Design a protein around this ligand. Structure first.
Ligand code: HEC
Ligand code: HEC
Ligand code: HEC
Ligand code: HEC
Ligand code: HEC
Ligand code: HEC
Ligand code: HEC
Ligand code: HEC
Ligand code: HEC
Ligand code: HEC
Ligand code: HEC
Ligand code: HEC
Ligand code: HEC
Ligand code: HEC
Lengths: 439, 439, 439
């Protein structure tokens, strides 16, 4: 194994966090440098008919877009950068630049010149939304910072497409709202939301009607028979995704349904999640219970240190819950709470009858995982008992602590004074709760 | 944890079986009560243009239906309730009623007034079909009655849509046969039938042609190139799904294929299932073999009592085969026979080449599960051996028997004389074979 | 259990290898015999209008094909068998024959009369391609020969459709290139390539546009916005799927993308696979490490003999890596290298962001499997330690070695001098590296 080329990180853990050079297409404001052979300052017309030979699809798309094709316009009345409206064609130079040796890759800031509302709404969201997916939910996230860059390359890419740039639900060089309204524009990131929507009758009607139904109309009351990702969350074309919030859902459901039917189905979600929590309470008592007696193989000391730089239990306040570089009991615990408990919430919400019970990450799988946890707990307790009686001092195996991949973990290189807590002190952005956060 | 609002059960175990209030939309004959704020007796025209503002999609659908749009009719010659035919529009009041304080939710009985044939054929099916999915395969089913209502909410809902009401394969307010013919109208319930159909070339041709092919024609000989769920099982529009039954399939396959090709492929199914049974015979001998020696942790007594109310082995006559609240050896056993052995049958039948071998619930996974069972058996036998020699009396752990979810199980509250066996004594409906059935 | 009817094998292990009679539709050159009731020599016109009643779909397809419908032709200038071009209709007798008692089932040889280029390109491929999928990757393959015929029926069928006959990507009786261009024509065999393509944005755009986009155009530069299976691998309609090979991909990607973007994404693939290998190096050291100490339950001698006929370790040169009829430690090892390590390569290549990390057969699952391997290793080492101290001689269990399915394995009947090494000596076809290969 040889270490690939790395560029320096950007988050609060930037002292040791690294990125692959490909990050330039994902954080253009921060990592973009010129790398074009071609030179010269060109007019838009020169850009198009030179790229028709070189990169034909972009041009073909651009001609299928409102930016490039004036006939394909609805007279929105867009006013870009200056007050004056845009009547001419929005070309390649408008988005990328005129000089080839000074090309810039566009973000939400570049789009914000022409489209203020869609950008303002995009920046209005808080923690967990599209607004803070890269800045917070990548740079401060445990599994991303706790792993080498090439492993979590897709993690940085996926979370950054929706935050930084605008071509998430919009193809790239067509920017069609009809394409954006489709569930396909959402599921390549949301994958276990897609499985719930697919196994529900809402998703089934999509596949049945998508070829026939009119996609040109905006996601508004009456306009659509089949609900999509964009219809439910991006209400009336809004670019931002407990009685006040519940009645808001019932009113949206009242587009096609009775409010009584809407209320009953959302009450099913409450009752379904409540019973799934009791399954977790059983598991948590078992796993933590094994830690009290110290029968867990291996113990946190016998394992490699976590990304914080401590030898702490994963499923315990302070420690980092993980699936990697930990004991099997801790792995099966994290598997239940993160994946399975979260997916049951998604199953009841998206009205998936199968995934509520029999499906992937379901209540029946929660029962299966509960057995897996209990059997693991039974195994460790039987071993310890036998060892105690015969008079054997068992020590955790060497392969738990050290390995070719395990040595590459950043947990070994964590030293006091490497955290930039001034990043955490920021008021403009929300923050993830971490042990070494400072604040 | 707090217990949600429950309404009383209906099956033979109605003494302890409960349901969520949402069951009213699924068993309207039995659980529907009025819950509308709005009052007054209205004409159909008043119903439509008041609901256009409130619930627009229903109205838009109703106008896209033959019931609401007379232009969209094929002159079937429907004769509803009375002998006289229906020439006028079938409105909202025809299905739901005139008074808002006295609204009724329609079943197969309400549809049976106008459509006698489709209802008669629907009621003609026996055990395991759509006919007895809720009455028998929910109220008498082990995993449904053996679990709290909010967990198995979707179980009651899914099985009841196809039995009680008619909007299973038919959207709801469009009732399009073209939509019903599509596999999407079937797979939201049938999910592992869908995976087999999808990974087969039959399902692949569906996705390739669905946008282009004519869906308006009935499922008859010649009419379709690509076979669907509705084409194979609902032959010639029949609303009801060994040489006599085999030749019946070959003749149906002869619509597109050679009978020799049809016979060879169905012979593959016979040979494929035969070899999958020998894998089960190996597993069964191992799991039951561990019960003879009493090495299973935990033993039925160490586990919580089953839904019947006994401390019996799961994979043994009398006992209830389950994945929950049992030992790992018993869980892996049930996983193989119910899911994997059943799915192999589905894989060979639906001509899925991948799912016959490499797929989910396949022959190769049966091999994987066989190892999982054998390793579990090896673990228990090695433990017992060591314990015996050193002189240790091992008792099953406490977390097996008792837990927050485990205490909520109905197995603890089973008392003699709670079974309504007069339900089981019925001649009009088939019955599931249970231990405490009485007959 | 009773053994189904078997026909003799054909590969180098033909002494014990068997096939189901259904192989006649898959190896027609080798296994096809007449089995038709109907007799007589007929003209093409007699074939069509007799099969319109009997097998209507074939006829309807044939009329929708260029072979049967002259109007549906692009004037290719096909010249069949003789030099003279084909102007008349290519009928049923042209493909199958005139006499019913002397019908032949077509291969690539039968198609090669009319279409020389598409056949020549089909035969140009080497090991691992469509060219040698049945002859080499079935008859010489370990899991196929090491299992009874009815279990690996689909294995023979799937691998033979693409090699022997031509109706793989082409329906059967339509032979539409538009249908062949679609990913659906590929994924029924390629299933974990499909999951990677589906979860990527390339596959998402397919489902979004397939109903609208023009499929009639050939897979060429500019012609398509959305890349498919056929677009990427079958470049410019070529019927054959490190700087020289890398730049070839970048140029193909340059159809829609910047070469810098193309280079960066393929560099991500290199770095992603490199880190996945270190996870394997950890696993391999652990599993083989357990074999040195002899703590593996069961040991190769305690297991049934492999398909070669030896009692060797699976994950060791000479031995056969398998998931069946082996220890759990060996199973989990094979699961990682074959499925998971191979799927990570597929995930990075097909630009799937989800399947790079969280998906099925991913880097995060590699971490999960690494724990599973380590826990299994920990279990075996703890057992052996306890046994040694107390003075117990542990022997592997009987159910590992013998069973109803295990007895049916060909490993028991392997005798010296059963291998046809003259098959392996062939120069016209590449060969799989086996222990008993001879050369
Ligand atoms: C900055 C990053 C963004 C800009 C600028 C725009 N978008 Fe979007 N977008 C999305 C959807 C689903 C729609 C269709 C809404 C509907 O149902 O009607 C749109 C639409 C637009 C429009 C058209 C609005 C109009 O009134 O004409 C514009 C001008 C537009 N978008 C610009 C989806 C998404 C999305 C989800 C993943 C993101 C991140 C963005 N859009 C971001 C931007
Ligand atoms: C009571 C519960 C039901 C009534 C009343 C009807 N159906 Fe269905 N249905 C289904 C399919 C797949 C079709 C299309 C059949 C074809 O291929 O041609 C239909 C069609 C009908 C029709 C039209 C028949 C005609 O000759 O015009 C009527 C009037 C009709 N259905 C009424 C599917 C299903 C289904 C599967 C899930 C169920 C449960 C029902 N239908 C139930 C009813
Ligand atoms: C022998 C086994 C084969 C013959 C003879 C032909 N094919 Fe194919 N084929 C495939 C695709 C994806 C296409 C479309 C290519 C495109 O994008 O334009 C085709 C096309 C043809 C054509 C038309 C070529 C023309 O210039 O008109 C012919 C005559 C043809 N094929 C004959 C895919 C495949 C495939 C993949 C699974 C296989 C095995 C074959 N084709 C095999 C044959
Ligand atoms: C013909 C001589 C061209 C003209 C005029 C313009 N572009 Fe170009 N561009 C051209 C080629 C052959 C390439 C690929 C090789 C390379 O230099 O990278 C490109 C590349 C781009 C890129 C990607 C550059 C990168 O950093 O990866 C962009 C963003 C781009 N081109 C845009 C662009 C614009 C906006 C132009 C008009 C002013 C323009 N190009 C002119 C060929 C030619
Ligand atoms: C990939 C680039 C995405 C696309 C396209 C869409 N979404 Fe997304 N979404 C994505 C990420 C990485 C995140 C952040 C996850 C986190 O919690 O850190 C989100 C967030 C959401 C949310 C908010 C979830 C919450 O805070 O509770 C919603 C409601 C949501 N996404 C829905 C959604 C819809 C409807 C989309 C289609 C238009 C969509 N997303 C696109 C990744 C991506
Ligand atoms: C793109 C295909 C993804 C990859 C790669 C990863 N993430 Fe993601 N993220 C994705 C979605 C759309 C969602 C679901 C959001 C929802 O509302 O449930 C998420 C979810 C996770 C969460 C976990 C939970 C929570 O605590 O909020 C976070 C914040 C997050 N994602 C982190 C993250 C990182 C950086 C990844 C690599 C280690 C990981 N994601 C993969 C899909 C995208
Ligand atoms: C306007 C005043 C209305 C007229 C006239 C009719 N309906 Fe209605 N309906 C209306 C509203 C605002 C609501 C939702 C609030 C509520 O009372 O539940 C409804 C609801 C229904 C329902 C669902 C009732 C339930 O139990 O959940 C049904 C089945 C229904 N409406 C049907 C219906 C019919 C058949 C009518 C004609 C006689 C009719 N409604 C008239 C508003 C109005
Ligand atoms: C959900 C509401 C369903 C829809 C829509 C369809 N089916 Fe179904 N089917 C469903 C259930 C709950 C059951 C009973 C399961 C049991 O065994 O208890 C069935 C049953 C069948 C059967 C009979 C199986 C047997 O007895 O061997 C068949 C053949 C079947 N279903 C096929 C089928 C088809 C082709 C459908 C589309 C028109 C369809 N079902 C719709 C649930 C649901
Ligand atoms: C709707 C999405 C479903 C949910 C929820 C559950 N069931 Fe179901 N059932 C479904 C289908 C369509 C099938 C397959 C039928 C086939 O022919 O194989 C079934 C299968 C099960 C069976 C198991 C086997 C047999 O013994 O017949 C039964 C009878 C049954 N279903 C019971 C049942 C209950 C009540 C559920 C919750 C505990 C369970 N189902 C979930 C899909 C639908
Ligand atoms: C009517 C009398 C027919 C004429 C004339 C032809 N075929 Fe036929 N064919 C017919 C039937 C009723 C059947 C099914 C019963 C059977 O004999 O198998 C067939 C079958 C075929 C088959 C499949 C045979 C097999 O081995 O499975 C083929 C390949 C076939 N038919 C082709 C064919 C051709 C090319 C003809 C023209 C010369 C022809 N058939 C004439 C009925 C009749
Ligand atoms: C089923 C009949 C298949 C269809 C249809 C397609 N492919 Fe395939 N492919 C199939 C097999 C059985 C194999 C051999 C697997 C082996 O390694 O033994 C292949 C091989 C390929 C390859 C070569 C892989 C390699 O050697 O590295 C490629 C690139 C490939 N297949 C792609 C591919 C595409 C793009 C297809 C659509 C046109 C396609 N295949 C069809 C099985 C089948
Ligand atoms: C059709 C649905 C399949 C079945 C059944 C099996 N095989 Fe296959 N094969 C399939 C594909 C398209 C691929 C992927 C090719 C790629 O490039 O990755 C394969 C892969 C395997 C390989 C494994 C790896 C390698 O060493 O090349 C081989 C050679 C192979 N296939 C063997 C084989 C046999 C005979 C099967 C039964 C035991 C098995 N395949 C199932 C899909 C098709
Ligand atoms: C109907 C309206 C829909 C549809 C068609 C989809 N979703 Fe959602 N979704 C919906 C609800 C009512 C909820 C629950 C919200 C609540 O009451 O708490 C959700 C939930 C989600 C979530 C989880 C976010 C959270 O924690 O609150 C996500 C990420 C999400 N939905 C995304 C999503 C996607 C991608 C969809 C398309 C496939 C989709 N949803 C469909 C309502 C509806
Ligand atoms: C874009 C171009 C695509 C698309 C749309 C698909 N694939 Fe591929 N594929 C592509 C690349 C660049 C690679 C890696 C090749 C390399 O550099 O080594 C692959 C890889 C495969 C493989 C593995 C073959 C190998 O070992 O090299 C297979 C079997 C394969 N692809 C098939 C495949 C199928 C069936 C697709 C449709 C769903 C598909 N690909 C999409 C490039 C691209």
């Amino acid at each position: 194994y040889t270490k690939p080329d790395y560029v320096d990180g950007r988050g609060p853990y930037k002292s040791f966090l690294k990125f692959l050079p490909s990050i330039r297409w994902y954080d253009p404001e921060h990592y973009w440098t010129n790398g074009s052979q071609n030179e010269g300052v060109f007019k838009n017309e020169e850009c198009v008919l030179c790229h028709t030979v070189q990169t034909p699809t972009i041009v073909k798309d651009w001609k299928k877009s409102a930016h490039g094709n004036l006939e394909m316009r609805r007279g929105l009345g867009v006013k870009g950068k200056d007050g004056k409206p845009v009547e001419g064609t929005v070309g390649c130079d408008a988005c990328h630049g005129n000089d080839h040796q000074k090309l810039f890759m566009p973000t939400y800031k570049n789009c914000g010149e022409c489209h203020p509302r869609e950008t303002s709404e995009h920046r209005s969201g808080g923690l967990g939304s599209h607004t803070h997916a890269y800045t917070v939910n990548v740079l401060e996230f445990s599994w991303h910072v706790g792993k080498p860059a090439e492993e979590v390359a897709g993690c940085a890419e996926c979370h950054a497409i929706v935050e930084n740039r605008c071509d998430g639900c919009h193809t790239r060089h067509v920017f069609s709202p009809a394409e954006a309204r489709k569930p396909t524009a959402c599921r390549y990131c949301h994958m276990d939301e897609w499985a719930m929507y697919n196994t529900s009758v809402h998703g089934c009607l999509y596949e049945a009607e998508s070829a026939t139904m009119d996609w040109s109309k905006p996601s508004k009351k009456g306009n659509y028979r089949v609900p999509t990702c964009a219809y439910c969350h991006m209400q009336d074309g809004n670019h931002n995704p407990h009685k006040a919030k519940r009645d808001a859902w019932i009113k949206k459901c009242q587009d096609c349904h009775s409010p009584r039917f809407a209320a009953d189905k959302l009450k099913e979600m409450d009752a379904g999640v409540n019973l799934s929590f009791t399954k977790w309470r059983e598991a948590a008592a078992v796993i933590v219970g094994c830690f009290l007696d110290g029968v867990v193989d291996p113990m946190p000391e016998g394992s490699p240190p976590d990304w914080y730089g401590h030898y702490t239990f994963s499923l315990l306040p302070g420690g980092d819950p993980r699936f990697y570089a930990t004991s099997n009991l801790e792995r099966l615990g994290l598997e239940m709470i993160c994946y399975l408990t979260g997916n049951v919430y998604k199953a009841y919400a998206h009205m998936s009858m199968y995934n509520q019970t029999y499906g992937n990450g379901s209540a029946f799988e929660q029962d299966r995982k509960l057995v897996e946890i209990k059997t693991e707990a039974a195994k460790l307790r039987r071993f310890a008992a036998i060892e105690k009686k015969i008079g054997l001092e068992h020590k955790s195996e060497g392969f738990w602590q050290h390995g070719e991949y395990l040595d590459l973990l950043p947990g070994w290189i964590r030293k006091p004074g490497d955290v930039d807590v001034e990043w955490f002190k920021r008021t403009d952005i929300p923050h993830r709760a971490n042990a070494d956060a400072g604040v």
